[PDB]
Symmetry: C3
């Protein structure tokens, strides 16, 4: 639907994924943090190419499509919430219910036959771990848990994060994240030196192709992901060589991190432990449009008591956010951006030359092609 | 010619109008005020996607296409008017007559076989009511009166206004203008308060459909337009309700305005009376390109003599311009801009959901579709 | 390939030239000066649409395509030259030899089957007269002399130059350069006045179409060019008329310049003498992309010894660069830019109306169409 049929034919083994330029419909996605949206103060945003309005009403979140049924203007241009339960289009005063999208009133024509007989599209919203998730799909939504990595929703897991808009397609973000050899870019990181991480330059793989990854299609709440097991049989590269001469060494720190690395639909990486042995990193690459994503970073630490919680809050702000979420991950941002040109025309998917450590990436592409819950197209974006 | 055939065959009610992205060829359009162009001071502008040069020579206006026949440069990059009767291309000095566009000389080669054997496109130009009209069309022009709203050319009707370039397709401007229910956007206008206007929110129509409008396809000078009769038999709305509760009230002033609204080919709106009961508004939405229009506003007031004309002028500069043409219509500007996205891919025309107040707009689309004097295409712009 | 057949079929005689939007493959092009590329300090540039990296290693220049075979990033985003012989991609550390482009190492997996089995595209590079030439082509290069104008490579010819990026297609630049009537744009030039150059407004051509130019294909190094001979038997215009009336005069002067004007593949103009009787100007219009070129300007002066070289350089910096290469040729830059719109949709090639002195340009279009060594296409750029 999205990509020239010529290219799609050439990537048969994961063509649904190459097509999913705008992301995967019928999944939950994080778009902002709970505390960024107050009572009665609506926010606009674009998710999988659709402009959305989110409002907090009696503590509860609601999401309407930010496009009037009449002449297709964004309501956010001028928000007129004249009652608690409604929003009034600034243009001809079509008035919709936040709860169900129902065109309940037209102030400029009380007697109109459209009234009660049209519905602005709505999307479920759920708040969890101080994160706002929207189900960008059709019908009654599945549990949040299906579209979140293992442990994100654990009772004791405290979640702190950061969100920004990055100018690359979401998939370039995903693949960079789940790429075992890309850790080469992080070799001069501030986190690596100052927090004494053990970090190889990469891995010389071992075993058959089936031992590189473990596909998880078999989760009890219905998660779909791929674990990267290149470390299992692989030999870490700590002395990098050219013509058999050593020209670069990995970092020989004492702290062991990134034991498990996994990628889950709809596109969320989990690295454990990271950036410290007492934490995990959960990060989403959410489609905004074909060129843009929210980089939705979260750090998780199990906490029992408030003093634990408040201590973590403080470590997050003084160490982890600036030294890890920025320090470390800023290189991931540049790397994503640097792939834009080669994949901009959709030709990159066929002219790329992969090598052994990309097995993980390929397993993700296959996984994503088979278990996605729909492909967002221009038809979803338009009408 | 301009819009995907797939889109056109799904707007069979008014397909030529949806195709008329660059506007309609073979009509007169206003592009500036007489006073804005002095003797021997050529001005460049773009009309229906064509770059034009206008000049005033011995008080009379002339118009040439601003594109040399030779290497297609705009003459206006460096205007060389070396005799009153001619313009000389800065590049290789092909020299053309203003009056007929004939290539009469070439300074770089006076023996060229091209001399007297080529002609640069000219367009008729005529001034009326201190407005400059160009006949962007072919062959002999009709009277100007055909393409102007009734009373605009009355001998006592004094015209003053303002012109600006607005980034929306000309049709978005037109429909907004002739939209009985968009009046809602003006409810907190300073004009409405300080000039004490009887402006409602909107209307509940009365009776037949054919009855909401009056099509004028039968005007003696060949005018073609639609009058809005929504509230000849239709009840106007002053108290806007949601779930029975009044949430908004219209305008409570003593002056009755906008008793007759009409839209005329090629795209000019008459609002009578407005913004005061002794005035009319005549405003054009002139296609510059696919994305842009001149918003050529005028106010007309009958004046007996130049004394009453001075008073009107004072009242215009001091009151009506800042309060009406800016204050009031500034809202019309950002409303047009708000429809751009939805209509940009030509998909807005199939995906819009209209209601009863838009009976007027649909009649216009059909009027325009039947009675236009031609569709401007890229073929006219280029070749 | 690059241009629609609807157009190419209407320019028989020079359709390959019209197709050569990105320029001609399998020629040498100047891109920068020797002084600008230092030992161990690579630079990126785009030539014929392709991003390239140039390095100086043991004084010798090398050129690699600036696009990793792996995920198609530019290496130049973050240059890692870890030995004198190699460059290492910053992303996953694929390591390429400069000399032959072979993938000789990968620091992230030194056991990859990819090693020794892949080759990054290289191009030959060669320096002459302080200028850096890249052979943007396949296989083994011809001598550089084929792609330089005559006398440029002469033992005694001191070359001093200037280079900048200009926003027009390269062909618009060439055509303006070699256009015998374009001199009209130089009539108010400070160089013409202050150096008292004899400069007609143009030439009334002298007799036979077949003899306004001389094609050269027999040259000892296989150079391919056209000489403009309009001035051989042409009558100069010093008194330009409109309706018999003298409206502009040419520039009388002692100094006879530009009696020898030639254009050469791949796109280099020689004007001799210029801007003084004992100098000449060689200038290239080097395609960067469809919209953009390097305007690579040089002045040549036979210098017998160092006193001559040093006083030439004094003259260049104080006089010839600001008055000639900047003052005079600034008008050529605007002339090129003014033709962009007409040729941008490829329709200018069919809609242009030529006159007698354009014979020179047509001779060049046919020469170029006959003797170029390949058309650069999008598939050379991408894959
Ligand atoms: N993928 C990783 C492998 C080893 C160590 C750290 C990471 C990692 C963690 C968070 C974000 C990233 O982009 C990473 O590469
Ligand atoms: N082509 C020329 C003809 C007469 C005088 C000067 C020139 C000339 C020399 C160098 C660069 C240019 O653009 C010129 O027009
Ligand atoms: O949008 O504004 C106009 C156009 C310009 C001035 C005043 C207008 C007006 C008044 C009453 C009904 C519809 C209307 N359209
Ligand atoms: S555009 Fe929202 S009511 Fe008309
Ligand atoms: S472009 Fe106008 S005379 Fe050549
Ligand atoms: S993109 Fe260069 S080594 Fe991977
Ligand atoms: Fe990373
Ligand atoms: Fe020139
Ligand atoms: Mg002189």
């Amino acid at each position: 639907a999205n990509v020239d049929e010529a290219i799609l034919k050439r990537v048969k083994g994961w063509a649904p994924y190459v097509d999913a330029k705008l992301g995967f419909r019928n999944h939950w996605y994080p778009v902002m943090f709970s505390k960024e949206i107050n009572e009665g103060e609506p926010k606009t945003l674009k998710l999988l190419g659709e402009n959305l309005l989110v409002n907090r009403i009696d503590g509860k979140l609601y999401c309407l499509k930010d496009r009037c049924l009449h002449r297709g203007v964004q309501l956010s241009v001028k928000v007129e919430c004249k009652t608690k339960s409604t929003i009034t289009c600034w243009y001809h005063a079509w008035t919709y219910r936040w709860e169900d999208g129902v065109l309940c009133d037209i102030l400029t024509n009380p007697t109109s036959a459209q009234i009660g007989r049209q519905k602005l599209k709505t999307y479920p919203v759920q708040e969890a771990k101080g994160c706002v998730f929207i189900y960008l799909g059709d019908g009654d939504p599945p549990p949040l848990a299906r579209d979140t990595p293992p442990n994100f929703l654990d009772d004791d897991m405290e979640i702190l994060g950061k969100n920004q808009i990055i100018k690359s397609n979401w998939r370039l973000a995903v693949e960079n994240g789940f790429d075992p050899s890309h850790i080469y870019i992080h070799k001069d990181s501030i986190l690596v030196k100052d927090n004494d991480l053990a970090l190889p330059l990469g891995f010389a793989p071992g075993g058959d192709r089936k031992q590189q990854t473990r596909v998880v299609d078999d989760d009890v709440v219905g998660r779909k992901g791929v674990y990267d097991l290149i470390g299992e049989h692989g030999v870490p590269v700590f002395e990098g060589t050219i013509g058999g001469e050593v020209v670069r060494e990995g970092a020989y720190g004492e702290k062991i991190v990134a034991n498990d690395i996994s990628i889950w639909l709809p596109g969320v990486l989990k690295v454990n432990p990271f950036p410290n042995p007492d934490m995990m990193q959960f990060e989403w690459y959410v489609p905004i449009d074909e060129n843009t994503h929210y980089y939705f970073q979260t750090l998780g630490k199990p906490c029992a008591n408030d003093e634990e919680r408040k201590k973590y809050e403080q470590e997050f702000e003084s160490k982890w956010k600036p030294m890890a979420l920025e320090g470390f991950n800023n290189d991931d941002i540049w790397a994503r951006e640097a792939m834009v040109d080669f994949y901009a025309d959709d030709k990159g998917w066929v002219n790329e030359i992969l090598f052994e450590s990309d097995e993980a990436i390929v397993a993700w592409r296959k996984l994503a092609s088979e278990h996605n819950q729909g492909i967002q197209t221009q038809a979803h974006v338009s009408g």
